[PDB]
Amino acid sequence: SAVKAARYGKDNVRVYKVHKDEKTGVQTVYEMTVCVLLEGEIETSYTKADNSVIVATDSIKNTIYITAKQNPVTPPELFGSILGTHFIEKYNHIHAAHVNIVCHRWTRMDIDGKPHPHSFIRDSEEKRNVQVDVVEGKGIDIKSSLSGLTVLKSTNSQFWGFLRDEYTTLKETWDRILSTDVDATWQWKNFSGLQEVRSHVPKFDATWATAREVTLKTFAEDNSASVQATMYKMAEQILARQQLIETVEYSLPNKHYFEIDLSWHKGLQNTGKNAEVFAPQSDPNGLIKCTVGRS
Amino acid sequence: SAVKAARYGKDNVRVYKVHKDEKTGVQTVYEMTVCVLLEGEIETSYTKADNSVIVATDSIKNTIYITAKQNPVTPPELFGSILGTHFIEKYNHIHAAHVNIVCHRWTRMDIDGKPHPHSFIRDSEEKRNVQVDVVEGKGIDIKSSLSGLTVLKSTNSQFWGFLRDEYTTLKETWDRILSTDVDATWQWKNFSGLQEVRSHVPKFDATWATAREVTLKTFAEDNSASVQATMYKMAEQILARQQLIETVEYSLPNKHYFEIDLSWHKGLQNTGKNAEVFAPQSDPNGLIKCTVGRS
Amino acid sequence: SAVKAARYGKDNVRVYKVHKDEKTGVQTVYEMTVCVLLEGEIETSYTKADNSVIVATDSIKNTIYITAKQNPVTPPELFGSILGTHFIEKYNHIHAAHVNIVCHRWTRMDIDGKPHPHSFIRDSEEKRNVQVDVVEGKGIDIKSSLSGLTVLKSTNSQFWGFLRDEYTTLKETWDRILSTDVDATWQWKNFSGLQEVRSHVPKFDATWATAREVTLKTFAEDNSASVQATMYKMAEQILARQQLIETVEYSLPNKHYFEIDLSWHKGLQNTGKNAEVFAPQSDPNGLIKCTVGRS
Amino acid sequence: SAVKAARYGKDNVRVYKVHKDEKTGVQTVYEMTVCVLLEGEIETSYTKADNSVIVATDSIKNTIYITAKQNPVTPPELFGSILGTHFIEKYNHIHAAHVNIVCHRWTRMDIDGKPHPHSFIRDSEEKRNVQVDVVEGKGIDIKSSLSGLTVLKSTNSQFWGFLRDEYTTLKETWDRILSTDVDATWQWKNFSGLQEVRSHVPKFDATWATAREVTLKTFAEDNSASVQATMYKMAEQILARQQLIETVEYSLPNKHYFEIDLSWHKGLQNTGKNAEVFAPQSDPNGLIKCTVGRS
Ligand SMILES: O=c1[nH]c(=O)c2nn[nH]c2[nH]1
Ligand SMILES: O=c1[nH]c(=O)c2nn[nH]c2[nH]1
Ligand SMILES: O=c1[nH]c(=O)c2nn[nH]c2[nH]1
Ligand SMILES: O=c1[nH]c(=O)c2nn[nH]c2[nH]1
Ligand SMILES: [Ar]
Ligand SMILES: [Ar]
Ligand SMILES: [Ar]
Ligand SMILES: [Ar]
Ligand SMILES: [Ar]
Ligand SMILES: [Ar]
Ligand SMILES: [Ar]
Ligand SMILES: [Ar]
Ligand code: NA
Ligand code: NA
Ligand code: NA
Ligand code: NA
């Protein structure tokens, strides 16, 4: 046998960091879950019980904590880059670092009108994430995303004119519910190293903000021909609003809500135009993915 | 043997309902998970295979759906009452109905400044719930609650002067993080029936709003002596702001965040006054409950 | 206001312990999640910021770990008792200790026929649990249970002759699937203290074994008239097989599996006697509880 | 813009099927969760609101159910192939079908010694899975796996001689606990179509059985130099026992259990050779992956 591929490291490192403006007295907190996996000349640790090549997962956990103390942890794209550059610059036999960051929401609380200086609320389970791959002599590839953004519109969603054969039972509809959890990824042009990443830093928040803003607006205003048609509109708006983005990716569940025929009981009318009460369906669910780049 | 207690019914009924103002064109959606358990003279179904006494769980699922079409599903306290009264008035041998409702958030989206007429976002996993027990010849007891409200303050939390013996290793602190998920219950005075419930309807939202408002403010403004001291302050503020509430209950995890000594590495300083990076601890967690009523 | 009820302590303490027979070289591992909540004269910690009355949750976490080192952690009923007695005997102002233990399965692996001396497998997510309430001057109440025991029979389950009214749509069936997760609790006679608990120790495993054995057999052999009828049979068999048990409790979901009419497509026959393919329904689910004691 | 990649279909289709030997009266049940995603000339559904190209996700749900009635659902590798071939042979514009199956355990119950003819138990949350990609004019690629297989050995695991620098705090150990959840994938040689898949059918169970048997034995008998060294041994044993397997993949968390220094309290000794009580750590966790093919 032989080692064809190998990576190893530390998953699920929970990390908190506070910033104290000792002038204003305003505190900002950040919270993330971090994973770092390394590659390189580490095959012997697998084939020959040679641990001499292993930076211990424990130590990678140390490094995450250390790097966070020594550097800003915002924006995620930058922290990832700094963390991954460390591993490949520090160790000769380590040739790639793979850094996934999941960011958790701590939104400043508004109390009696006023933004409060050090109290926070998890106002969603929506996440901002990054995948940052730092390969030696290749640069830094960054996939940014927002995920777990759960939305529902009660009308202005259609689905008609799909293929009908002897497998088809679904009725054409000109008015349905559409609900999804948004998973959106945008992939940056290759950067050459930390310097280039640092030169674009303001763009990372900007593009994230844009992605979320477009997602929410297109969803609410579009008279959806299908999930397919609506997600493509979002994607092409994002690509047009930031040229450092090479591709845009959406994975979207169709979280169906079924009409309930209630007419067997007192001729009660609750379908079509009369539909008021709906059965949310835990499963199964439609799943729709698309990758959109420039023509 | 003999049947000492028995209840049965349907759990986890997912329910959606839209309201369309066909004037304005504004739609409001509601989503909940419903459980109804019945009691009465149903022992024979257990001891003698006598199914004649059983309203089928399936049918209870029907009734939930039906009741929702025939009535408003807001406020939860009212829907519960209507649903539970149905069972005990309809069936002679059914003497109590137990109705738990969990309400899901669908907050209207703000698009380009403007409230959108039919698009919604799950802007938290926080729930509003009710437990409504309708017992025949006894009235309607209602426990309302908010839950899953996750908060964190970065300072203005203390814990010193606790008992110290040969089991104690915890250091006194005059500045720590405090994070919790809020579970708050307030118990209404017994109501006599649907009429009395209907006469107070506006109070149910009001009190909920109050509970959440007090919870968030007391948490942010209080220089916490302990979780114990801070939750009692919330409870007594709620009791004072609504006389139809008999008791107030808080269950609160203490979701610890530990300091990370980083001084073994380059004499780096990250404890006490220097603390910037923290290890959120998934487990274990402190748990603190209190029931507070009037003196 | 005033404190009506109060308890506090530590939840979700994960605990592992190995036993090494240094004779045979056979190791036995145990793993549990532990919660201890205390009561007593602790109101002032809530009303007056008086922390002097508080055994710190941290210290309760210490005590769990310590008690486990100093004592056997099997059987759960005994460990609970020892742990809870500690708190009420140690502290004057602590008058009750509430101890929930959840036990995790580590079943010895069979390798090449032979029981292996120190390798284990989680061969189910089924748990053995205890609730042990130690109240000062009142003794020790113990609720033992098994839970998360998930079963399914493909036939020999019936449900006919239930009430039919204008809410009923469910068809009578003389052959259906029955699936559930078993939650079974048996409540011991009050014990006077640790001595009495120690005098019965062998009974705790025995009764657990019995409960599981009866549960599985009655489920498999009974031609079920209903969940109601089948669970009562289990309960009365357990009560008859151990006189130190005062009551037996079952909570059981009915995890429905629906027939799929496939006759719209090539007159394919998949209902009634022809039924081969079924839709497992995540929700909603029937829920059936019973408490059975002696006549 | 333009569509770079696109797939769509139905996720989380829950499926049950019983087999009745009407001779013996022995029933066998099967339960799985199924996902089918299609590709082809479907870009217009995204760019031009052209639904004419879409086989509705609903219909794909039908097809899963239908295919299951018309064919055996065991072994998973075969069902996948049949299901995926259907889509690409049926529709001109559909050029690839992607079929993930997750299999759920229903192990026949042993009652009073005897295998019971129609009663079953979920005796683990361990799954057997397949990923079957059917691409038109390319054949059938199959990734089989077992997952969620959770194991722990109490000794005979070592970790020493890893790199030590100014990031390292972890102590070398010649005796620790090793716990993991096993995720093992083995990738078959490309098959040309359904015929070739059918010609190897007996091998699929065999290889699965082998994978699990090797996994469990190597884990229990190996004096682990590291997770790395132990997983490679498993992989090379599997490759040697089946030549139709091209590569073998392991993803493995290191689910750490920490020693508890209890010496601050009554000089109690619970470290090194004395260690009996351990803190299972929910997070973070070491993660170790390897892909092993033939030299
Ligand atoms: O928007 C939709 N896209 C689809 O592909 C689909 N299939 N069924 N329903 C659907 N709705
Ligand atoms: O606020 C707190 N209350 C407690 O009871 C406690 N115990 N440890 N830490 C604590 N913090
Ligand atoms: O066993 C059953 N008990 C019930 O109470 C019931 N209700 N619907 N189906 C049922 N099956
Ligand atoms: O088996 C192990 N492999 C590793 O790579 C490692 N790192 N810390 N501990 C470890 N144990
Ligand atoms: Ar952070
Ligand atoms: Ar969409
Ligand atoms: Ar509703
Ligand atoms: Ar609090
Ligand atoms: Ar234990
Ligand atoms: Ar049952
Ligand atoms: Ar199946
Ligand atoms: Ar391993
Ligand atoms: Na390097
Ligand atoms: Na009645
Ligand atoms: Na006491
Ligand atoms: Na095709």
Side-chain angles (χ1 to χ4, degrees):
Chain A
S1 296
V3 171
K4 297 308 193 208
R7 64 180 59 180
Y8 89 95
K10 193 73 112 202
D11 202 4
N12 291 303
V13 174
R14 306 191 55 198
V15 187
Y16 169 106
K17 179 176 199 197
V18 57
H19 168 279
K20 302 167 176 191
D21 198 76
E22 273 296 340
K23 324 61 158 71
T24 66
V26 169
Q27 313 197 342
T28 309
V29 305
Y30 301 87
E31 193 189 317
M32 40 181 197
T33 303
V34 173
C35 170
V36 162
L37 300 174
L38 313 182
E39 285 187 289
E41 293 159 59
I42 63 180
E43 73 101 351
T44 57
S45 80
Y46 290 90
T47 50
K48 294 304 193 226
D50 169 38
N51 292 326
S52 82
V53 290
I54 296 160
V55 187
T57 68
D58 191 78
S59 308
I60 294 160
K61 172 192 70 172
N62 296 343
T63 310
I64 301 162
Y65 290 144
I66 296 167
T67 302
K69 176 58 172 209
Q70 281 176 336
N71 295 265
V73 296
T74 180
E77 288 84 355
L78 175 63
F79 183 67
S81 296
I82 291 168
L83 192 50
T85 298
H86 170 71
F87 287 103
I88 61 145
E89 284 184 358
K90 184 66 186 179
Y91 304 98
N92 289 358
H93 65 304
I94 301 308
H95 295 303
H98 303 282
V99 183
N100 181 265
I101 299 170
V102 173
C103 291
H104 305 282
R105 281 170 74 92
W106 284 124
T107 285
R108 195 170 308 277
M109 290 188 173
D110 284 313
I111 300 308
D112 286 330
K114 321 163 284 187
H116 188 278
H118 59 254
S119 281
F120 306 88
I121 179 163
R122 170 132 330 147
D123 62 306
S124 189
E125 278 302 300
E126 164 196 344
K127 310 300 192 190
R128 180 175 166 185
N129 323 289
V130 299
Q131 188 74 40
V132 171
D133 305 292
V134 180
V135 172
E136 198 162 353
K138 280 211 154 301
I140 294 159
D141 303 290
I142 296 162
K143 268 138 86 86
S144 305
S145 61
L146 57 78
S147 73
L149 170 43
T150 294
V151 299
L152 182 160
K153 74 195 302 179
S154 50
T155 191
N156 282 208
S157 159
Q158 304 183 39
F159 191 65
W160 51 267
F162 43 96
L163 190 154
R164 303 191 79 83
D165 67 19
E166 68 276 15
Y167 292 85
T168 314
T169 71
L170 169 74
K171 282 168 260 73
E172 290 179 331
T173 172
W174 288 262
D175 195 17
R176 67 179 191 172
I177 295 144
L178 179 55
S179 200
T180 196
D181 321 324
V182 178
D183 189 347
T185 308
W186 50 99
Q187 164 127 225
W188 299 89
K189 171 198 70 80
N190 185 268
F191 304 108
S192 57
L194 225 38
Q195 207 194 316
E196 193 178 1
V197 178
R198 270 194 229 264
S199 81
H200 291 297
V201 162
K203 299 202 190 59
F204 294 122
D205 285 358
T207 312
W208 169 84
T210 297
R212 197 182 190 273
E213 192 224 79
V214 169
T215 290
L216 289 175
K217 185 176 143 147
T218 317
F219 175 79
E221 285 177 359
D222 187 52
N223 214 303
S224 189
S226 61
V227 178
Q228 284 91 327
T230 305
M231 71 209 278
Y232 178 83
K233 286 183 185 160
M234 302 168 173
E236 97 183 314
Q237 284 176 85
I238 294 170
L239 273 181
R241 296 204 199 350
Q242 180 47 256
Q243 300 305 113
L244 265 330
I245 291 301
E246 251 146 58
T247 57
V248 165
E249 221 177 303
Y250 276 89
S251 185
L252 295 181
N254 193 8
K255 320 169 73 192
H256 322 283
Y257 287 62
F258 290 176
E259 289 192 357
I260 310 156
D261 196 348
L262 279 181
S263 76
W264 49 275
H265 170 104
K266 299 180 182 177
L268 196 54
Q269 284 306 154
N270 184 44
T271 64
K273 267 162 88 179
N274 295 120
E276 274 175 304
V277 174
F278 281 85
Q281 307 280 302
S282 290
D283 46 86
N285 61 271
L287 177 66
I288 327 283
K289 310 181 184 281
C290 197
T291 302
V292 178
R294 298 148 185 297
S295 52
Chain B
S1 296
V3 171
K4 297 308 193 208
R7 64 180 59 180
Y8 89 95
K10 193 73 112 202
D11 202 4
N12 291 303
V13 174
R14 306 191 55 198
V15 187
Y16 169 106
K17 179 176 199 197
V18 57
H19 168 279
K20 302 167 176 191
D21 198 76
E22 273 296 340
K23 324 61 158 71
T24 66
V26 169
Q27 313 197 342
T28 309
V29 305
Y30 301 87
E31 193 189 317
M32 40 181 197
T33 303
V34 173
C35 170
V36 162
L37 300 174
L38 313 182
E39 285 187 289
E41 293 159 59
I42 63 180
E43 73 101 351
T44 57
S45 80
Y46 290 90
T47 50
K48 294 304 193 226
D50 169 38
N51 292 326
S52 82
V53 290
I54 296 160
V55 187
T57 68
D58 191 78
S59 308
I60 294 160
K61 172 192 70 172
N62 296 343
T63 310
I64 301 162
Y65 290 144
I66 296 167
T67 302
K69 176 58 172 209
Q70 281 176 336
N71 295 265
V73 296
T74 180
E77 288 84 355
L78 175 63
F79 183 67
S81 296
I82 291 168
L83 192 50
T85 298
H86 170 71
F87 287 103
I88 61 145
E89 284 184 358
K90 184 66 186 179
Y91 304 98
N92 289 358
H93 65 304
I94 301 308
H95 295 303
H98 303 282
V99 183
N100 181 265
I101 299 170
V102 173
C103 291
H104 305 282
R105 281 170 74 92
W106 284 124
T107 285
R108 195 170 308 277
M109 290 188 173
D110 284 313
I111 300 308
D112 286 330
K114 321 163 284 187
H116 188 278
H118 59 254
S119 281
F120 306 88
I121 179 163
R122 170 132 330 147
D123 62 306
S124 189
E125 278 302 300
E126 164 196 344
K127 310 300 192 190
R128 180 175 166 185
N129 323 289
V130 299
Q131 188 74 40
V132 171
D133 305 292
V134 180
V135 172
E136 198 162 353
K138 280 211 154 301
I140 294 159
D141 303 290
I142 296 162
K143 268 138 86 86
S144 305
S145 61
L146 57 78
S147 73
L149 170 43
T150 294
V151 299
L152 182 160
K153 74 195 302 179
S154 50
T155 191
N156 282 208
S157 159
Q158 304 183 39
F159 191 65
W160 51 267
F162 43 96
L163 190 154
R164 303 191 79 83
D165 67 19
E166 68 276 15
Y167 292 85
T168 314
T169 71
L170 169 74
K171 282 168 260 73
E172 290 179 331
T173 172
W174 288 262
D175 195 17
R176 67 179 191 172
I177 295 144
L178 179 55
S179 200
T180 196
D181 321 324
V182 178
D183 189 347
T185 308
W186 50 99
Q187 164 127 225
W188 299 89
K189 171 198 70 80
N190 185 268
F191 304 107
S192 57
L194 225 38
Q195 207 194 316
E196 193 178 1
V197 178
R198 270 194 229 264
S199 81
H200 291 297
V201 162
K203 299 202 190 59
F204 294 122
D205 285 358
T207 312
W208 169 84
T210 297
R212 197 182 190 273
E213 192 224 79
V214 169
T215 290
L216 289 175
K217 185 176 143 147
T218 317
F219 175 79
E221 285 177 359
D222 187 52
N223 214 303
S224 189
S226 61
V227 178
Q228 284 91 327
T230 305
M231 71 209 278
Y232 178 83
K233 286 183 185 160
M234 302 168 173
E236 97 183 314
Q237 284 176 85
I238 294 170
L239 273 181
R241 296 204 199 350
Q242 180 47 256
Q243 300 305 113
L244 265 330
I245 291 301
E246 251 146 58
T247 57
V248 165
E249 221 177 303
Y250 276 89
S251 185
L252 295 181
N254 193 8
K255 320 169 73 192
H256 322 283
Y257 287 62
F258 290 176
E259 289 192 357
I260 310 156
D261 196 348
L262 279 181
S263 76
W264 49 275
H265 170 104
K266 299 180 182 177
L268 196 54
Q269 284 306 154
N270 184 44
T271 64
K273 267 162 88 179
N274 295 120
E276 274 175 304
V277 174
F278 281 85
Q281 307 280 302
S282 290
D283 46 86
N285 61 271
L287 177 66
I288 327 283
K289 310 181 184 281
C290 197
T291 302
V292 178
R294 298 148 185 297
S295 52
Chain C
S1 296
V3 171
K4 297 308 193 208
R7 64 180 59 180
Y8 89 95
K10 193 73 112 202
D11 202 4
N12 291 303
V13 174
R14 306 191 55 198
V15 187
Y16 169 106
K17 179 176 199 197
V18 57
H19 168 279
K20 302 167 176 191
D21 198 76
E22 273 296 340
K23 324 61 158 71
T24 66
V26 169
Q27 313 197 342
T28 309
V29 305
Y30 301 87
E31 193 189 317
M32 40 181 197
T33 303
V34 173
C35 170
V36 162
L37 300 174
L38 313 182
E39 285 187 289
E41 293 159 59
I42 63 180
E43 73 101 351
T44 57
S45 80
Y46 290 90
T47 50
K48 294 304 193 226
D50 169 38
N51 292 326
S52 82
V53 290
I54 296 160
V55 187
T57 68
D58 191 78
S59 308
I60 294 160
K61 172 192 70 172
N62 296 343
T63 310
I64 301 162
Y65 290 144
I66 296 167
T67 302
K69 176 58 172 209
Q70 281 176 336
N71 295 265
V73 296
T74 180
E77 288 84 355
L78 175 63
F79 183 67
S81 296
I82 291 168
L83 192 50
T85 298
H86 170 71
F87 287 103
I88 61 145
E89 284 184 358
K90 184 66 186 179
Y91 304 98
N92 289 358
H93 65 304
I94 301 308
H95 295 303
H98 303 282
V99 183
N100 181 265
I101 299 170
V102 173
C103 291
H104 305 282
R105 281 170 74 92
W106 284 124
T107 285
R108 195 170 308 277
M109 290 188 173
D110 284 313
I111 300 308
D112 286 330
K114 321 163 284 187
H116 188 278
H118 59 254
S119 281
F120 306 88
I121 179 163
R122 170 132 330 147
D123 62 306
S124 189
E125 278 302 300
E126 164 196 344
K127 310 300 192 190
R128 180 175 166 185
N129 323 289
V130 299
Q131 188 74 40
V132 171
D133 305 292
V134 180
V135 172
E136 198 162 353
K138 280 211 154 301
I140 294 159
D141 303 290
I142 296 162
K143 268 138 86 86
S144 305
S145 61
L146 57 78
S147 73
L149 170 43
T150 294
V151 299
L152 182 160
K153 74 195 302 179
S154 50
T155 191
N156 282 208
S157 159
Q158 304 183 39
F159 191 65
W160 51 267
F162 43 96
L163 190 154
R164 303 191 79 83
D165 67 19
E166 68 276 15
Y167 292 85
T168 314
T169 71
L170 169 74
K171 282 168 260 73
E172 290 179 331
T173 172
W174 288 262
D175 195 17
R176 67 179 191 172
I177 295 144
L178 179 55
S179 200
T180 196
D181 321 324
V182 178
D183 189 347
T185 308
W186 50 99
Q187 164 127 225
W188 299 89
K189 171 198 70 80
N190 185 268
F191 304 108
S192 57
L194 225 38
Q195 207 194 316
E196 193 178 1
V197 178
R198 270 194 229 264
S199 81
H200 291 297
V201 162
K203 299 202 190 59
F204 294 122
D205 285 358
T207 312
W208 169 84
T210 297
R212 197 182 190 273
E213 192 224 79
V214 169
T215 290
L216 289 175
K217 185 176 143 147
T218 317
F219 175 79
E221 285 177 359
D222 187 52
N223 214 303
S224 189
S226 61
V227 178
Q228 284 91 327
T230 305
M231 71 209 278
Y232 178 83
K233 286 183 185 160
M234 302 168 173
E236 97 183 314
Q237 284 176 85
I238 294 170
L239 273 181
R241 296 204 199 350
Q242 180 47 256
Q243 300 305 113
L244 265 330
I245 291 301
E246 251 146 58
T247 57
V248 165
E249 221 177 303
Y250 276 89
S251 185
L252 295 181
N254 193 8
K255 320 169 73 192
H256 322 283
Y257 287 62
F258 290 176
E259 289 192 357
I260 310 156
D261 196 348
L262 279 181
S263 76
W264 49 275
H265 170 104
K266 299 180 182 177
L268 196 54
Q269 284 306 154
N270 184 44
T271 64
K273 267 162 88 179
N274 295 120
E276 274 175 304
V277 174
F278 281 85
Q281 307 280 302
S282 290
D283 46 86
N285 61 271
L287 177 66
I288 327 283
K289 310 181 184 281
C290 197
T291 302
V292 178
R294 298 148 185 297
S295 52
Chain D
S1 296
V3 171
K4 297 308 193 208
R7 64 180 59 180
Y8 89 95
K10 193 73 112 202
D11 202 4
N12 291 303
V13 174
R14 306 191 55 198
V15 187
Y16 169 106
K17 179 176 199 197
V18 57
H19 168 279
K20 302 167 176 191
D21 198 76
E22 273 296 340
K23 324 61 158 71
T24 66
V26 169
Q27 313 197 342
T28 309
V29 305
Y30 301 87
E31 193 189 317
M32 40 181 197
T33 303
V34 173
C35 170
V36 162
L37 300 174
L38 313 182
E39 285 187 289
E41 293 159 59
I42 63 180
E43 73 101 351
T44 57
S45 80
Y46 290 90
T47 50
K48 294 304 193 226
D50 169 38
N51 292 326
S52 82
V53 290
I54 296 160
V55 187
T57 68
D58 191 78
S59 308
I60 294 160
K61 172 192 70 172
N62 296 343
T63 310
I64 301 162
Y65 290 144
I66 296 167
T67 302
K69 176 58 172 209
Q70 281 176 336
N71 295 265
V73 296
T74 180
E77 288 84 355
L78 175 63
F79 183 67
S81 296
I82 291 168
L83 192 50
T85 298
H86 170 71
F87 287 103
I88 61 145
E89 284 184 358
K90 184 66 186 179
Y91 304 98
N92 289 358
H93 65 304
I94 301 308
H95 295 303
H98 303 282
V99 183
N100 181 265
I101 299 170
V102 173
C103 291
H104 305 282
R105 281 170 74 92
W106 284 124
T107 285
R108 195 170 308 277
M109 290 188 173
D110 284 313
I111 300 308
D112 286 330
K114 321 163 284 187
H116 188 278
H118 59 254
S119 281
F120 306 88
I121 179 163
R122 170 132 330 147
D123 62 306
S124 189
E125 278 302 300
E126 164 196 344
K127 310 300 192 190
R128 180 175 166 185
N129 323 289
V130 299
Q131 188 74 40
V132 171
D133 305 292
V134 180
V135 172
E136 198 162 353
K138 280 211 154 301
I140 294 159
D141 303 290
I142 296 162
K143 268 138 86 86
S144 305
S145 61
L146 57 78
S147 73
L149 170 43
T150 294
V151 299
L152 182 160
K153 74 195 302 179
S154 50
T155 191
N156 282 208
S157 159
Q158 304 183 39
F159 191 65
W160 51 267
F162 43 96
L163 190 154
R164 303 191 79 83
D165 67 19
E166 68 276 15
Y167 292 85
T168 314
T169 71
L170 169 74
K171 282 168 260 73
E172 290 179 331
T173 172
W174 288 262
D175 195 17
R176 67 179 191 172
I177 295 144
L178 179 55
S179 200
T180 196
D181 321 324
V182 178
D183 189 347
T185 308
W186 50 99
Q187 164 127 225
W188 299 89
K189 171 198 70 80
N190 185 268
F191 304 108
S192 57
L194 225 38
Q195 207 194 316
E196 193 178 1
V197 178
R198 270 194 229 264
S199 81
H200 291 297
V201 162
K203 299 202 190 59
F204 294 122
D205 285 358
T207 312
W208 169 84
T210 297
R212 197 182 190 273
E213 192 224 79
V214 169
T215 290
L216 289 175
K217 185 176 143 147
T218 317
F219 175 79
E221 285 177 359
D222 187 52
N223 214 303
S224 189
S226 61
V227 178
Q228 284 91 327
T230 305
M231 71 209 278
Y232 178 83
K233 286 183 185 160
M234 302 168 173
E236 97 183 314
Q237 284 176 85
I238 294 170
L239 273 181
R241 296 204 199 350
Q242 180 47 256
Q243 300 305 113
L244 265 330
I245 291 301
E246 251 146 58
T247 57
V248 165
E249 221 177 303
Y250 276 89
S251 185
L252 295 181
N254 193 8
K255 320 169 73 192
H256 322 283
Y257 287 62
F258 290 176
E259 289 192 357
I260 310 156
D261 196 348
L262 279 181
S263 76
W264 49 275
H265 170 104
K266 299 180 182 177
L268 196 54
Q269 284 306 154
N270 184 44
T271 64
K273 267 162 88 179
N274 295 120
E276 274 175 304
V277 174
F278 281 85
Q281 307 280 302
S282 290
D283 46 86
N285 61 271
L287 177 66
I288 327 283
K289 310 181 184 281
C290 197
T291 302
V292 178
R294 298 148 185 297
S295 52

